[PDB]
Every structure is written in C-alpha cells, then in structure tokens.
Amino acid sequence: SMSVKKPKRDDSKDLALCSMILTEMETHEDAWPFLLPVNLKLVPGYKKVIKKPMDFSTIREKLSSGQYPNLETFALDVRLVFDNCETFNEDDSDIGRAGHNMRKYFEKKWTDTFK
C-alpha cells in the first residue's frame, strides 16, 4: 500500500531473457504454423472466429519496440498464440500437435528462467 512495498525483484534482465526464449521458440522445428500472421484473406473462418490473432513475428516486433510493459504481458501473448491454435485446429492434426508441443516447450523455459 502507500509507502509499504515488498522487496524490489530485479527485472533489469527480463527483456533480454524474453528475447532469448522467443529466439528458442522461433527456431523450434514445430514453430512453422506460428511464425507469421494467419492470412485472413486466405483462411476461411479465421477472421470471424479468432478475435485476437497473435503470432511469433508480431510478438517479436512488440518486444523490440517496447510494447510489453512487463514479462507477464509477454507470456499472455505467447499463450494467446497456443489458445488460438487450439480453438481452430483439431488436436489430431499436424498444426494441433505443433501447438501442444510448443506450449509445453514454452512453459518449461518460462518456469526454468523465472520461477
């Protein structure tokens, strides 16, 4: 509360460390469904159904331009990528499996780096 603060967690490396995680996600072999925004002209149903599209390139541009206020808003956009994928893709499809694999990969790096 006013003039009563928990001890200051060192957040000065967060930007660099989110960048490193994001590099590891970009270079994973199963990243291909997520590298670029879904083409809303060419994929029927996507525009109407997925209210907030997100992809790794969009996250990379937001990261690079100071549009994440803190590491939690960064994790929210990564998770959005996988939540969108589960909304639109069957679990038993290549893209559906890719999304589960990537979410797992991300969540481990996140825990190991920050928890």
UniProtKB/Swiss-Prot annotation:
Q: Where is the Bromo domain?
A: 9-113
Name where it's found.
Answer: Nucleus
Q: Which Cys residues form disulphide pairs?
A: none
**Which tissues is this chain's protein expressed in?**
Expressed at varying levels in several tissues, whereas a smaller transcript was expressed specifically in testis.
Quaternary structure, from the entry: Component of the BRF-1 ISWI chromatin remodeling complex, at least composed of SMARCA1 and BAZ2B, which regulates the spacing of histone octamers on the DNA template to facilitate access to DNA. Within the BRF-1 ISWI chromatin remodeling complex interacts with SMARCA1; the interaction is direct. Component of the BRF-5 ISWI chromatin remodeling complex, at least composed of SMARCA5/SNF2H and BAZ2B, which regulates the spacing of histone octamers on the DNA template to facilitate access to DNA.
Question: Member of which family?
Answer: Belongs to the WAL family.
Main function: Regulatory subunit of the ATP-dependent BRF-1 and BRF-5 ISWI chromatin remodeling complexes, which form ordered nucleosome arrays on chromatin and facilitate access to DNA during DNA-templated processes such as DNA replication, transcription, and repair. Both complexes regulate the spacing of nucleosomes along the chromatin and have the ability to slide mononucleosomes to the center of a DNA template. The BRF-1 ISWI chromatin remodeling complex has a lower ATP hydrolysis rate than the BRF-5 ISWI chromatin remodeling complex.
Q: What is this protein called?
A: Bromodomain adjacent to zinc finger domain protein 2B
**First-to-last residue of the parent protein present:** 2054 to 2166 of 2168
